[PDB]
Amino acid sequence: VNSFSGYLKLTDNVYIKNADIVEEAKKVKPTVVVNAANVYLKHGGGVAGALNKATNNAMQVESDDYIATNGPLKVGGSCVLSGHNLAKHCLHVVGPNVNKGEDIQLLKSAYENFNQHEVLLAPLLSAGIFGADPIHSLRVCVDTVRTNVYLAVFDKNLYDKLVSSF
Ligand SMILES: O=C(O)C[C@H](NC(=O)c1ccc(NC(=O)NC2CC2)cc1)c1cccc(C(F)F)c1
Question: For the chain, which terminal residue's Cβ has fewer other Cβ atoms within 10 angstroms, N or C?
Answer without folding.
Answer: N
